[PDB]
Scaffold this motif. Structure first.
Motif, PDB file in Angstrom:
ATOM      1  N   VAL A  35      42.917  31.314 -46.599  1.00 41.79           N
ATOM      2  CA  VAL A  35      41.792  30.416 -46.758  1.00 41.79           C
ATOM      3  C   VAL A  35      41.154  30.813 -48.071  1.00 41.79           C
ATOM      4  O   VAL A  35      40.608  31.915 -48.213  1.00 41.79           O
ATOM      5  CB  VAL A  35      40.765  30.558 -45.624  1.00 41.79           C
ATOM      6  N   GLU A  79      38.411  25.989 -48.710  1.00 40.95           N
ATOM      7  CA  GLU A  79      37.133  25.974 -48.005  1.00 40.95           C
ATOM      8  C   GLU A  79      36.030  25.959 -49.023  1.00 40.95           C
ATOM      9  O   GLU A  79      35.776  26.963 -49.679  1.00 40.95           O
ATOM     10  CB  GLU A  79      36.987  27.203 -47.098  1.00 40.95           C
ATOM     11  N   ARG A 120      36.443  22.563 -44.774  1.00 41.07           N
ATOM     12  CA  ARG A 120      37.752  23.175 -44.937  1.00 41.07           C
ATOM     13  C   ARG A 120      38.859  22.123 -44.730  1.00 41.07           C
ATOM     14  O   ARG A 120      38.820  21.348 -43.771  1.00 41.07           O
ATOM     15  CB  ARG A 120      37.915  24.313 -43.945  1.00 41.07           C
TER      16      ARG A 120
END
Ligand code: CU
Ligand code: CU
Ligand code: CU
Ligand code: CU
Ligand code: CU
Ligand code: CU
Lengths: 336, 336, 336
Positions: A35, A79, A120
């Motif tokens: 992420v 994100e 996200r």
């Protein structure tokens, strides 16, 4: 992946940099999916876009036009923390063309002044992609006030040519092209407005002509020239990412070529080769790979030369190295 | 190759011909690399561009708009002698999009009236490519006054389809498309100017509208119609090279197709096939291969039909041969 | 094939339906080549194109803008009966970009009011193709008054990806985009005319600006929105055919992608993939294949957002199904 599976992935935590530079990244992915975390703040602010002091009430991601290039790899999650300061007057949001769902994220990110949001998405498709603000009912006004940029989703194995061989760049630049529509008084002089809302009605009328007053790279005429020229050396491999969120463009490196051009911006669509002038439709990003072979000044332009030379769409490269007389030579210099 | 190695190569010595015709050449290269020699002289002269006697102060390579098509093979050297007569008033130069270095050659070829220059470059990339004048600070004005054309760099083995099979044309035509920006008086009547410099200020203002007054093939409305229509026969294979140095175009053969179209103009980028209307961005050349299957008149147009029919961008082919009722037939002719 | 051989082929006999819907057909051909029969009648009629009651004297195949999508398979014959009612005032004809010969059929189909004609052509090339009226000397006026549509010539084996694997859609829509040029009085108010001929002179002057007043889908601002939104479900595979007979467009599905896009419209030219915004030149059709992955509203636009949001070029999809949080999630909803 489930919620717990995504929550368990490694994070990073990227500091975005001002165009035409691009934040540190690796061409080939380091490890499994991550992420990747980005933060942007929207600035409503006056900017000067030409040599005659023409002022626009910009909207600008991280205060720049274009907004910064975010780089992730395919199947990473991007994100984004998006912040709309309380000193702003308008609601803003973000549509990622790389994303799937909710109008590119626009439907989930509408933030009034004083609000923030975190979105996200999974970057499922490799390529360069536009992002822009898109508030219902005032979409083109935010976009052509400067509120757009691009992202690059690299293949996990980095870039390749049409036969699967690696293409590894030494440097990368991001050129954002912006069409501006600046109102004029009856005498033909560009107007200044005290507040951005004062400019709206007049601006829509100019927009409806489909004829921009200025077409600029990095937010102003000459922003990528002089001391701010891009640079390279003979033998150096350069990726040039180019975006236009609203209007067509036709990039051309004067004195070079696009050796490989993903003119659609999408890495699973094989690149065109040996390009003189490529074409990027409004609402898209594209990318061109070039190995410099000659030193000297290069101009990088929108090859509608009226747009380039009269309206602002021209940048420079200054390239170091040894001249190649095989490739080109003056057999007889200009002479009477 | 070294200086001595290039100096030792065979020379040829080509006599350029007026568009839409193309000088004699061989599709497959004859022998090894050559230095192919071309001469052009720039003419500053009045031309008439429409049926209503509209006059422009042209600039024109070898006196034509577009300038002539130069044909070489990949890895030949193109050696151009460029002459700017002492009766001209402006400095001119040349940027070859096929070339690498010095702004396409523009930086090495700035010739004032009364000067000449000889530029040599290696034609390293196969394709059709634009060339145009490009004097610093007055680039689009020279280009849209007519100072552009194209070259073709054939693969040494001639043209091929996407699977490597030969494509050999019976004839070739070069269609140059020119956007003109002609000033008008308050009554809407096109203006005539005594000297070209008198037209400059007024011309820039029209150019900044991004709206041409005329979009023409071979330098005038109807220049490739009537007695000057292009010609072919049923069964004949024709290559149509098309260029636009400043502005987008979308060629279409009315009643035919582009069987193979190098829409980017670059021969190492596989051709699109079965095309109805192809797209060539401003600052590029493209090429289309077609085998005629039906006799009769064909129109070849920019398929913005306002540009074609109102602004001048339409040519004709007259094609001889036998009608094919299998491909098309009038089952019932127009009747009450 | 000989006259007797064609006369012996099976017939069908298709009832055309109003866009954006498409008449029943099979993706994979049923049996050998057929003569597929279509009938259209041209209507000259007033239509309203925006929310402010702007009226145009349309010309319209089967009374719609765009005209209906005709679907055949490669090497079928398309046999069109075209009827020009005696209550019309103008001659009309038809140019099929899919056809070979006689200006696309235009030369064989000139019908005055009170006449009909039947044209047959062999659909030799697979793809989506524009068709439009094209009366000599008044071509763009008929086209931009609404007299255009498209056809699809499916491969006999239906659609495939670049590696030969089947692509089978669950549904298909046809989006026709129309540029309109509506005159205004000195006060800037759109003009109404009693007869279509009254509008001609004023209309040509607006057309020559190359600046449309309206750019609409299915004939009016908002025609494919609200109750008339297109629809799909998560997991459903949708083909979206798009045409523009006169002017460039750059389609974009906001919140989705073009998974496979035949941007040239031609099925023997491999599709681009993972597209954000594709490009269709004026005088062409293109097609995009997408599998929906998220439910909710989508906007489908010309991504010149001025054209989309100010001039009318925006449609909606309403998509049913379950939200995918893996693909996209609001980690933190807009909040102070
Ligand atoms: Cu905004
Ligand atoms: Cu967008
Ligand atoms: Cu010049
Ligand atoms: Cu150029
Ligand atoms: Cu008609
Ligand atoms: Cu047409």
């Amino acid at each position: 992946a489930t919620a717990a599976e995504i929550a368990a992935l490694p994070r990073q935590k990227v500091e975005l940099v001002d165009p035409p530079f691009v934040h540190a990244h690796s061409q080939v992915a380091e490890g499994g999916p991550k992420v990747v975390e980005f933060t942007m703040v929207i600035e409503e602010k006056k900017i000067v876009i030409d040599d005659a002091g023409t002022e626009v009430h910009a909207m600008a991601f991280n205060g720049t036009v274009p907004g910064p290039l975010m780089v992730v790899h395919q199947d990473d999650y991007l994100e984004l923390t998006l912040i709309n300061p309380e000193t702003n007057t308008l609601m803003h949001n973000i549509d990622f063309h790389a994303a799937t769902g909710a109008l590119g994220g626009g439907g989930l990110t509408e933030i009034n002044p004083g609000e923030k949001t975190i979105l996200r998405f999974k970057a499922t498709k490799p390529g360069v992609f536009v992002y822009h603000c898109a508030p219902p009912g005032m979409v083109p006004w935010h976009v052509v006030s400067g509120l757009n940029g691009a992202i690059m989703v690299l293949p996990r194995e980095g870039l390749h040519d049409g036969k699967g061989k690696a293409l590894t760049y030494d440097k990368i630049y991001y050129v954002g092209e912006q069409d501006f529509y600046v109102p004029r008084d009856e005498n033909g002089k560009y107007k200044k407005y005290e507040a951005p809302g004062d400019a709206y009605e007049d601006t829509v009328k100019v927009m409806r002509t489909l004829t921009p007053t200025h077409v600029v790279f990095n937010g102003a005429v000459g922003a990528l020239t002089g001391d701010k020229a891009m640079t390279a050396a003979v033998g150096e491999k350069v990726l040039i990412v180019h975006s236009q969120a609203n209007r067509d463009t036709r990039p051309h490196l004067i004195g070079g070529h696009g050796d490989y051009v993903w003119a659609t911006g999408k890495f699973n669509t094989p690149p065109d080769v040996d390009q003189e002038t490529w074409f990027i439709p409004g609402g898209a990003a594209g990318a061109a790979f070039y190995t410099f072979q000659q030193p000297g000044i290069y101009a990088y332009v929108n090859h509608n030369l009226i747009e380039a030379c009269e309206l602002g769409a021209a940048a420079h490269f200054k390239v170091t190295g040894e001249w190649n007389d095989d490739l080109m030579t003056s057999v007889l210099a200009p002479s009477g």
